[PDB]
């Protein structure tokens, strides 16, 4: 994520970058499936309306979680303060041969 | 084939024996110095030819460099080595 946190009053939203490269360093070409969610101590609440499918060119990808969808995920912005967000990406090569699942939490 | 002989004579027009000088030689397009003759002039004192120049073989050695430790000012210090033709080309 661009920031190691998230500002509740940030219009832009939570910007996340998906970087994928082969073990030998070379860049990766494929398609990634990224989703979000909120954590509360030990409980996690997935956000189905945040599921994105962005292409991965030059071994890089760009995904954004609009504040609109985030707030709509619950039912008092000042309340979400203290909680945490977690990103779950899933890249698949254009050959459909290999598949990797990453995750940033906290 | 044709194989000719190249003789070089030089002398310093000074009062003292000139110190360490250099012999820059340029072969006639299609001629290479005899390897054996180079070893002879190399092993000799007051003369030096870097190992780099040695193992080049007839092929790539159109330019030669014979380092001299000194050159007399009284008489002429002359040396000579054999050269062979391996390329044959008019003019």
């Amino acid at each position: 994520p661009t920031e190691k946190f998230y500002y509740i009053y940030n219009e832009k939203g939570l910007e996340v970058t998906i970087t994928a490269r082969f073990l030998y360093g070379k860049k990766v070409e494929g398609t990634a499936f990224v989703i979000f969610g909120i954590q509360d101590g030990e409980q996690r609440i997935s956000l189905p309306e945040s599921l994105k499918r962005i292409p991965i060119e030059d071994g890089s990808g760009e995904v954004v979680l609009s504040r609109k969808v985030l707030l709509d995920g619950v039912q008092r912005a000042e309340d979400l303060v203290g909680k945490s967000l977690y990103v779950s990406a899933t890249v698949i090569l254009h050959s459909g041969s290999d598949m990797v699942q990453a995750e940033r939490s906290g | 084939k044709n194989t000719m002989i190249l003789e070089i004579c030089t002398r310093y027009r000074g009062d003292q024996d000139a110190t360490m000088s250099i012999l820059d030689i340029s072969m006639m397009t299609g001629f290479a110095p005899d390897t054996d003759d180079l070893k002879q002039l190399a092993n000799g004192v007051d003369r030096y030819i870097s190992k780099y120049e040695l193992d080049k073989a007839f092929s790539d050695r159109n330019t030669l460099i014979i380092y001299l430790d000194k050159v007399s000012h009284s008489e002429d210090d002359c040396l000579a080595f054999k050269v062979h033709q391996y390329f044959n080309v008019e003019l």
Binding site: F33, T90, I92, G96, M99 | -
Partner: protein, 190 residues
């Protein structure tokens, strides 16, 4: 051509996937294989079967080839037939050339063939046959092995004792008889 394939699955789960194949000829991409119980083999191959000019020399050459492993003069004792493949329980009356299978004269070695090759050689009962194949035709684990009548399996009808008297089967009785002695004591020309 190689059978294609299509795979379906969710992005969150790879385990729960289903894959189908497709081929312009074969059933549903699934290759050709002969299987009994839990013992299957790569039946992806050809079959085996107007008496041109089989001579004494034509046999000595094809019976001394690389793959040539076993050569017997057997007698078919029992003939069973299933819906997925037939078979022939033949007893060896002599071992012209012992192979990787340690078998004494008298024992029975099972032979197996596809159901489509029932028109190849109608192996009748109590008849003799000269046969030889490759070691790649063995099936199972020792000592319980099983022969396979494949493309490289030579199946020939061996006339009976009182049949060589016929003035039409003589040309074959002399060739088979000479081929026998030319193998037991002599051997291949290579």
């Amino acid at each position: 051509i190689q059978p294609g394939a299509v795979k379906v699955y969710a992005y969150y789960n790879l385990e729960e996937s289903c894959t189908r194949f497709y081929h312009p000829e074969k059933e549903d991409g699934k290759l050709n294989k002969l299987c009994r119980d839990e013992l299957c083999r790569c039946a992806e191959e050809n079959c085996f079967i107007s008496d041109d000019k089989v001579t004494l020399e034509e046999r000595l050459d094809k019976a001394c080839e690389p793959g040539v492993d076993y050569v017997y003069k057997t007698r078919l004792v029992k003939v069973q037939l299933s819906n997925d493949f037939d078979e022939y329980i033949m007893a060896i009356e002599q071992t012209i050339k012992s192979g990787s299978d340690e078998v004494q004269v008298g024992q029975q070695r099972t032979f197996i063939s596809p159901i489509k090759c029932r028109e190849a050689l109608k192996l009748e009962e109590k008849k003799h046959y000269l046969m030889w194949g490759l070691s790649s035709d063995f099936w199972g684990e020792k000592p319980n092995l099983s022969y396979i009548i494949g493309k490289d399996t030579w199946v020939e009808h061996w006339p009976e004792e009182d049949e060589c008297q016929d003035e039409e089967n003589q040309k074959q009785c002399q060739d088979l008889g000479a081929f026998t002695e030319s193998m037991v004591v002599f051997g291949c020309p290579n």
